[PDB]
Amino acid sequence: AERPTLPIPDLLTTDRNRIQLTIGAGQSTFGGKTATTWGYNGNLLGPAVKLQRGKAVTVDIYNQLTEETTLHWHGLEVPGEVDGGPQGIIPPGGKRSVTLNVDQPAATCWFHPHQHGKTGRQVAMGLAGLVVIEDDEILKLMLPKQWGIDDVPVIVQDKKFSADGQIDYQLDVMTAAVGWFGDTLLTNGAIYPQHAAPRGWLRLRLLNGCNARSLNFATSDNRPLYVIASDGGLLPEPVKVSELPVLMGERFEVLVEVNDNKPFDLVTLPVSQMGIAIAPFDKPHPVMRIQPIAISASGALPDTLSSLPALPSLEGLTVRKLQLSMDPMLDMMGMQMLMEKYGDQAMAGMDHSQMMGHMGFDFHHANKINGQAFDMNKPMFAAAKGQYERWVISGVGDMMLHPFHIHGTQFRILSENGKPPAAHRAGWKDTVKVEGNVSEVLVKFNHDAPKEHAYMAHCHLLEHEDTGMMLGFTV
Numbered sequence: 001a002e003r004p005t006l007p008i009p010d011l012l013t014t015d016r017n018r019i020q021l022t023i024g025a026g027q028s029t030f031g032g033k034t035a036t037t038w039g040y041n042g043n044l045l046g047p048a049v050k051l052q053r054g055k056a057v058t059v060d061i062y063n064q065l066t067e068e069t070t071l072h073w074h075g076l077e078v079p080g081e082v083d084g085g086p087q088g089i090i091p092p093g094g095k096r097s098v099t100l101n102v103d104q105p106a107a108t109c110w111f112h113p114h115q116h117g118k119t120g121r122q123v124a125m126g127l128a129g130l131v132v133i134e135d136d137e138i139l140k141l142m143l144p145k146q147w148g149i150d151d152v153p154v155i156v157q158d159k160k161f162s163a164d165g166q167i168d169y170q171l172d173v174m175t176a177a178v179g180w181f182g183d184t185l186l187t188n189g190a191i192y193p194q195h196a197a198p199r200g201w202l203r204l205r206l207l208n209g210c211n212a213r214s215l216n217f218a219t220s221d222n223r224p225l226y227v228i229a230s231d232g233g234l235l236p237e238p239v240k241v242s243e244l245p246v247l248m249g250e251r252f253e254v255l256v257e258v259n260d261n262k263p264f265d266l267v268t269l270p271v272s273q274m275g276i277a278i279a280p281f282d283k284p285h286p287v288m289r290i291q292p293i294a295i296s297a298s299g300a301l302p303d304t305l306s307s308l309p310a311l312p313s314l315e316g317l318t319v320r321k322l323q324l325s326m327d328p329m330l331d332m333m334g335m336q337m338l339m340e341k342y343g344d345q346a347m348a349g350m351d352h353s354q355m356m357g358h359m360g361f362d363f364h365h366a367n368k369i370n371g372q373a374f375d376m377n378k379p380m381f382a383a384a385k386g387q388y389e390r391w392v393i394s395g396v397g398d399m400m401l402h403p404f405h406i407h408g409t410q411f412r413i414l415s416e417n418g419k420p421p422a423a424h425r426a427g428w429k430d431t432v433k434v435e436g437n438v439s440e441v442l443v444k445f446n447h448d449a450p451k452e453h454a455y456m457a458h459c460h461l462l463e464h465e466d467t468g469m470m471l472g473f474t475v
């Protein structure tokens, strides 16, 4: 049969300078089986909210679920009051209005729930949206810009399904250790869709929307990807890559050539991550089928995209240390449950070093920062407003992958997991890899966050966040 077309999220702009988002339960079909799913302005996933830098907009958010949620704008530099972390509770049948005064460069950001201890479940049920920030600078470049034709959002997510076809989500000792992962890959909510792309340049806005699964994009015929933007917006010039690793909650925009009429796949390559490396993710896995077409397409790859500032001198900067840890009992219990469920396949992708690390009680608070499981009532510290700080985040002592995310900022990576960052990760980021080594970011918070609307800093492996690997901080 024909592959289904890639679903394109609606590009939603202001009215009275207002935007309406409805959070609701409905139904979706996956592999011919119906499931209860949640969506923003529909059944599953959500729209792309389109924002202009320097232009205020009001968002009216209606919770039509039968349980509490929050709405977090991932990668937006906004005050804590509108950040929608776990303190931004919207009750069932409630409404919250937020004024977003956008004051950052053009970027692809996203939005999702941040309900305390339930973020994994609420994203797994289908809640995620996009944010497209535009500025004068990006619109001058003549990048591909026809939304849903040559400028395409690609939200990649895995799920697992029970026998009846319902989403099979559980926060248990296995998923608290290694994450919630599945055997079914979704692309804008569809299984292995096709996208009809005009000949010339195709812009893909890639979002890893998975709870726990790291991805590594490539093409089926090894044509290159040209990275043009990271989480926080444009690189100074394009970076040519043959593969593109993307952690949970990271975005990159890439241009790819649609040259001849022969279709090719966007794929994800096997990653060395425990549980994630298991079949069917032990071989290259198709993400979507690009079908070349002949219709209007004038987008270009510019030699120069933007100016990236020199890093400042680090002397005098406040240093914060964040030591990530997991109770040895959770590693043991969680690993034991993984090995019970997958047997001989359980150590897929793992080298000798990775396995010897695993040497051979309430799990809801077993994941920690600085020896502390997340305490919603006790911000770990008071950060300075408008001042560079150096944040040193360590996974030394721990075997697992931790995409570390900091609210309220776009930062510069100084060191990523004991190496300088790759060229395409050296610009504006809101996520940094921590995996058995130490990362160092240069962060600045331009907006206030008081105690009662604190910013979060957490692992974006959502089951780790939900079982304690989060801290609140004031600005």
Ligand SMILES: [Cu+2]
Pocket: 072, 073, 074, 075, 405, 406, 407, 408
């Ligand atoms: Cu965030």
Ligand SMILES: [Cu+2]
Pocket: 400, 401, 402, 403, 459, 460, 461, 464, 465, 469
């Ligand atoms: Cu983690």
